[PDB]
Design an enzyme around this catalytic site. Structure first.
Site, PDB file in Angstrom:
ATOM      1  N   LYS A 148       0.820  -1.204   0.000  1.00  0.00           N
ATOM      2  CA  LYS A 148       0.000   0.000   0.000  1.00  0.00           C
ATOM      3  C   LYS A 148       0.868   1.275   0.000  1.00  0.00           C
ATOM      4  O   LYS A 148       2.086   1.179   0.153  1.00  0.00           O
ATOM      5  CB  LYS A 148      -0.953  -0.073   1.195  1.00  0.00           C
ATOM      6  CG  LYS A 148      -1.910  -1.260   1.128  1.00  0.00           C
ATOM      7  CD  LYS A 148      -2.833  -1.309   2.346  1.00  0.00           C
ATOM      8  CE  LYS A 148      -3.694  -2.560   2.326  1.00  0.00           C
ATOM      9  NZ  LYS A 148      -4.648  -2.624   3.464  1.00  0.00           N
ATOM     10  N   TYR A 201     -12.287  -2.012  -2.842  1.00  0.00           N
ATOM     11  CA  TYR A 201     -12.960  -2.033  -1.547  1.00  0.00           C
ATOM     12  C   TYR A 201     -14.476  -1.902  -1.694  1.00  0.00           C
ATOM     13  O   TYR A 201     -15.139  -1.313  -0.838  1.00  0.00           O
ATOM     14  CB  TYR A 201     -12.417  -0.920  -0.649  1.00  0.00           C
ATOM     15  CG  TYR A 201     -10.937  -1.042  -0.365  1.00  0.00           C
ATOM     16  CD1 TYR A 201     -10.452  -2.041   0.464  1.00  0.00           C
ATOM     17  CD2 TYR A 201     -10.027  -0.153  -0.920  1.00  0.00           C
ATOM     18  CE1 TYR A 201      -9.099  -2.159   0.726  1.00  0.00           C
ATOM     19  CE2 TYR A 201      -8.672  -0.262  -0.662  1.00  0.00           C
ATOM     20  CZ  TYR A 201      -8.216  -1.267   0.161  1.00  0.00           C
ATOM     21  OH  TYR A 201      -6.871  -1.388   0.426  1.00  0.00           O
ATOM     22  N   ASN A 258      -1.895  -0.305   7.184  1.00  0.00           N
ATOM     23  CA  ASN A 258      -1.280  -1.549   7.632  1.00  0.00           C
ATOM     24  C   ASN A 258      -0.262  -2.102   6.639  1.00  0.00           C
ATOM     25  O   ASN A 258      -0.021  -3.310   6.601  1.00  0.00           O
ATOM     26  CB  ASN A 258      -2.349  -2.599   7.946  1.00  0.00           C
ATOM     27  CG  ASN A 258      -3.178  -2.968   6.734  1.00  0.00           C
ATOM     28  OD1 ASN A 258      -3.187  -2.253   5.728  1.00  0.00           O
ATOM     29  ND2 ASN A 258      -3.892  -4.085   6.824  1.00  0.00           N
ATOM     30  N   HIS A 290      -1.521  -5.456   1.563  1.00  0.00           N
ATOM     31  CA  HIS A 290      -2.721  -6.258   1.386  1.00  0.00           C
ATOM     32  C   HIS A 290      -2.329  -7.650   0.920  1.00  0.00           C
ATOM     33  O   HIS A 290      -1.381  -7.810   0.146  1.00  0.00           O
ATOM     34  CB  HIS A 290      -3.655  -5.616   0.357  1.00  0.00           C
ATOM     35  CG  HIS A 290      -4.684  -6.557  -0.193  1.00  0.00           C
ATOM     36  ND1 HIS A 290      -5.812  -6.921   0.512  1.00  0.00           N
ATOM     37  CD2 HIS A 290      -4.743  -7.229  -1.367  1.00  0.00           C
ATOM     38  CE1 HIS A 290      -6.526  -7.770  -0.210  1.00  0.00           C
ATOM     39  NE2 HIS A 290      -5.896  -7.971  -1.354  1.00  0.00           N
ATOM     40  N   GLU A 295      -9.230 -10.612  -7.128  1.00  0.00           N
ATOM     41  CA  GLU A 295      -8.218  -9.563  -7.015  1.00  0.00           C
ATOM     42  C   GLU A 295      -7.198  -9.623  -8.149  1.00  0.00           C
ATOM     43  O   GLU A 295      -6.814  -8.593  -8.699  1.00  0.00           O
ATOM     44  CB  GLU A 295      -7.504  -9.650  -5.661  1.00  0.00           C
ATOM     45  CG  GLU A 295      -8.391  -9.358  -4.457  1.00  0.00           C
ATOM     46  CD  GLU A 295      -7.712  -9.675  -3.140  1.00  0.00           C
ATOM     47  OE1 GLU A 295      -6.465  -9.660  -3.089  1.00  0.00           O
ATOM     48  OE2 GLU A 295      -8.425  -9.932  -2.151  1.00  0.00           O
TER      49      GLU A 295
END
Lengths: 137, 138
Positions: free
Chosen positions: B10, B50, B113, B116, B127
């Site tokens: 990310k 998302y 975080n 992914h 994905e």
């Protein structure tokens, strides 16, 4: 500033799982990644890479190796990135490279030497144009 | 050894210089890198990614951050790679994660975080198709 360099992890470098290691060292130096991909180079592409060795012995051997597996192509950007690139990679021939550099730490053979970096801003601009399209950058 | 998972560093992960560290951990684990690119996602891509979270109040902030800068997209190939992906990354919430995992070592926030990972095989399927064309998976 907006100076760019081309770094390629050769098939031996990818098979030995040295891709992350190489990327991390450019990250630690504080440089910026602005292009990145993985491809098995075509015979035509490998020939283009060793272009100036076209008339030297065992040029096809090198082309064969370079296109024997996927490589990882990179463009890094920042002040003095090309010079930093060679400082990080170390001497092209592992016999002359010293410990602490990529080739110093991981390379032995002078042909299959894990990675390539542009030796000049001149060569860099040529090399990046060859492997990447402007939109990829 | 043909199963595939999708890994993405990310924008926070990229800015903090964690791309090499993450790739290295999948290489040591013994997995094969078969797809790779660097891209700043569009608003629409982030939303698409998302999409199941579109009705949550934290959705726009999530879409804003995920599209705020370059991410590095990855597909790894091998037996148990989706499982291993989870094992190497650790719990999605860093407060639940163990030291030794990516999030345990590098992450604090739930949103930021660092990386992914596909949570399941069929999720990996979606994905992967979402982020990659068929001619991009070597």
């Amino acid at each position: 500033s907006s100076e760019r360099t081309f770094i390629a992890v050769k098939p031996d470098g990818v098979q030995r799982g040295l891709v992350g290691e190489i990327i991390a060292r450019f990250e630690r130096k504080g440089y910026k990644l602005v292009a990145l991909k993985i491809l098995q180079p075509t015979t035509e592409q490998a020939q283009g890479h060793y272009k100036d060795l076209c008339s030297k012995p065992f040029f096809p051997a090198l082309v064969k190796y370079f296109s024997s597996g996927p490589i990882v192509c990179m463009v890094w950007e920042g002040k003095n990135v090309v010079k930093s690139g060679r400082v990080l990679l170390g001497a092209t021939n592992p016999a002359d490279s010293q410990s602490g550099t990529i080739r110093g730490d991981f390379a032995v053979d002078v042909g299959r030497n894990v990675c390539h970096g542009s030796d000049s801003v001149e060569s860099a601009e040529r090399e990046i144009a060859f492997w990447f399209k402007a939109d990829e950058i």
